[PDB]
Design a protein around this ligand. Sequence first.
Ligand SMILES: CCCCCCCC/C=C\CCCCCCCC(=O)O[C@H](COC(=O)CCCCCCCCCCCCCCC)COP(=O)([O-])OCC[N+](C)(C)C
Ligand SMILES: CCCCCCCC/C=C\CCCCCCCC(=O)O[C@H](COC(=O)CCCCCCCCCCCCCCC)COP(=O)([O-])OCC[N+](C)(C)C
Ligand SMILES: *CC(=O)N(CCCOC)c1nc(-c2ccc(OC)cc2)cs1
Lengths: 267, 437
Amino acid sequence: NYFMDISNVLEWIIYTTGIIFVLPLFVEIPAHLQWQCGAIAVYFYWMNFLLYLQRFENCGIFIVMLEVILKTLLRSTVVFIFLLLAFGLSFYILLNLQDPFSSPLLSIIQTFSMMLGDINYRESFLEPYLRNELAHPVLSFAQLVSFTIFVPIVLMNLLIGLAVGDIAEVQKHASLKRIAMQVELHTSLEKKLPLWFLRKVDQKSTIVYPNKPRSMLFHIFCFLFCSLEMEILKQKYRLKDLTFLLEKQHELIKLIIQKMEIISETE
Amino acid sequence: CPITEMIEYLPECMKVLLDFCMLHSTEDKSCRDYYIEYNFKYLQCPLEFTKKTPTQDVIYEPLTALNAMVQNNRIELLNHPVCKEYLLMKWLAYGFRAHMMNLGSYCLGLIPMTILVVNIKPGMAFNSTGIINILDTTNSYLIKTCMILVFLSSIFGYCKEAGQIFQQKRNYFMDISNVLEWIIYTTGIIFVLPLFVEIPAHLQWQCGAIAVYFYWMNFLLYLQRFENCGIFIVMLEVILKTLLRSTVVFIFLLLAFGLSFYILLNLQDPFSSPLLSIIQTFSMMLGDINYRESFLEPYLRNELAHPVLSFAQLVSFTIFVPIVLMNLLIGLAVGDIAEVQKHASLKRIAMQVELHTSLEKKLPLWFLRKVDQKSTIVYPNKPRSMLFHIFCFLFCSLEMEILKQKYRLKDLTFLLEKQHELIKLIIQKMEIISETE
Ligand SMILES: CCCCCCCC/C=C\CCCCCCCC(=O)O[C@H](COC(=O)CCCCCCCCCCCCCCC)COP(=O)([O-])OCC[N+](C)(C)C
Ligand SMILES: CCCCCCCC/C=C\CCCCCCCC(=O)O[C@H](COC(=O)CCCCCCCCCCCCCCC)COP(=O)([O-])OCC[N+](C)(C)C
Ligand SMILES: *CC(=O)N(CCCOC)c1nc(-c2ccc(OC)cc2)cs1
């Protein structure tokens, strides 16, 4: 049941790679492989260490917001791939004589770096144009203005709007989510402990002295640790009771007319 | 028809009517032989009323109840499991095959041009026997077949497009997808023509650039038919239309700053011509001002005519365009995306049911009689049929209450009026002795 879990996979990568980084105390290994593994291990240790901050109360809401934004980015990745591959192969054909666009894969990585707005207009477009070093100059400037309109303007603002919507959705229900994570942590931890330890550690009542201060280190830890629908439903209940009582009263009045005595008002 | 009437007026009774269409077999969820049956007898008309007939004057569009539920925004009925199984059956009947055929007929022209680009150095003239610089062999068997595939795909695209010309009859003129197909087909023809007529390499690569741009740009429009992707395409459409509405304010403000910098900074190379100055200010829009290179270092060498006016123009440009205008575009994008995601879950199922009800009107009636079904049987205990697992991994109210309140209060005041009339009748017919005067 643990196969569809990324935390297990991160632990596998960390443990194997940290084994290979340390093995020269038994078996001699070339230094290239050793530092190649040390890089991946030091990356994934501190990357995995964010997942242990989810258990705290002052931190876990940022981790769950980061999770939501990252999943939405994973949903947009296919539009990213196709649009970026379009612009990358177009710049590969247009700007072949320059060093950043020599290979197609280098051109794709260059357009991915140009995504944020580092276009390098003067170095790659203008100064080759003033030295007659651009084949197809008009097509090149038209490609430049089309790339500037599509990717850094439209797509980035799309990501910003998606992030704003997701963060508003998360912070709609933050205060319930915090206490839900705490009670889930305790009710999952309690199912594994033995029963005699539960009988020996629990309590049934607490006594709090508000005048006496609590027990320096605790002060530093405290510094680091720092409805219409139900109303209309009640309205509906009261109106239903009202119409029931009025029906009974109407029946009694018809009984009065049925049993009434009429003299000197007939015909 | 009363089913459409129930969808229009009382949808919560249609919910119960759909609840009668779900049958549980053994009422034991642990059994491996346990199943449930879905019946689809109320969701559509008989198929004879669908096709136009000289005897039957009236017609009905296919998927009747689903179209009626889409036009009345009854999403709680669309999320009912009988409707989900109905769309799943309708997709596995004929939708997947027609969709994969329509995608493959385009991908057959898409792939070989990308192969032909990434396996030939640009700028060189290439022919069926190889690359001319002397002739380079050892790839000619691949290059020849790729050029033949692109040529054949382009001429069959012409034939399909001319069929749509003689079919649609000038209603297709206000459509950008037809125009993109025209550009793709003509330009891919011109990129491949040296297997018949010799063409200079400059025109050949000039056409190859435009073709490889517009193939992958057009290929985004075929992702709109999927469910996991099309909402991004429609959000991109909305944002791009709003940018097209703001383009005139862009043009006037940018032309102001461009001609001002053309007059001020004439001695520098990026502002030599007026059109180059306009393109330079358009590039400076995002925040790449080049303060040190264009403003400060000419000032410390006494190379600026009008220095005070130049720095005032710099601070005015920095305030207007990268601060105000970009934040205006961000606010417009946030509002439009919130508006789209207000109605996402209805829009997805609406696109799916529109795709099926548009595809079904063209198929012949005997094929409809031979492919459809009336009931499905699902075994929840037995897993479905590796490749399917990879495909599943890649594929992963106050107003009505106050209205009811108003109805009940109106009934209440009607009954109280009748009761008041009866009490006045009691006083009219009552007998009074020993209480008179
Ligand atoms: C030209 C190129 C163009 C390319 C564009 C492509 C664009 C596409 C971009 C991104 C899409 C892919 C995202 C990859 C994983 C995201 C899912 C995820 O972690 O969310 C969830 C946590 O979310 C969090 O809040 C945790 C965040 C920390 C994890 C970071 C590890 C990443 C290191 C990799 C770097 C590798 C590089 C190595 C190089 C040396 C985990 O999933 P879950 O099951 O929901 O929750 C279970 C959580 N518990 C219970 C386990 C706690
Ligand atoms: C100094 C300069 C300053 C200038 C500032 C100017 C700023 C102005 C900027 C932009 C305004 C102009 C935008 C042009 C078209 C936008 C309309 C459009 O596609 O929306 C809709 C789709 O929307 C989508 O979601 C599809 C998106 C993909 C299409 C990309 C093709 C563009 C390539 C061109 C590049 C050319 C360069 C060539 C160079 C070699 C299509 O229209 P629709 O009818 O609503 O929907 C029908 C959709 N179906 C049914 C067909 C599916
Ligand atoms: C409203 C609609 O979609 N239906 C419901 C179908 C369920 O009952 C079979 C319609 N029914 C008719 C109809 C007309 C004539 C005949 O021939 C006997 C059958 C059904 C038209 S739409």
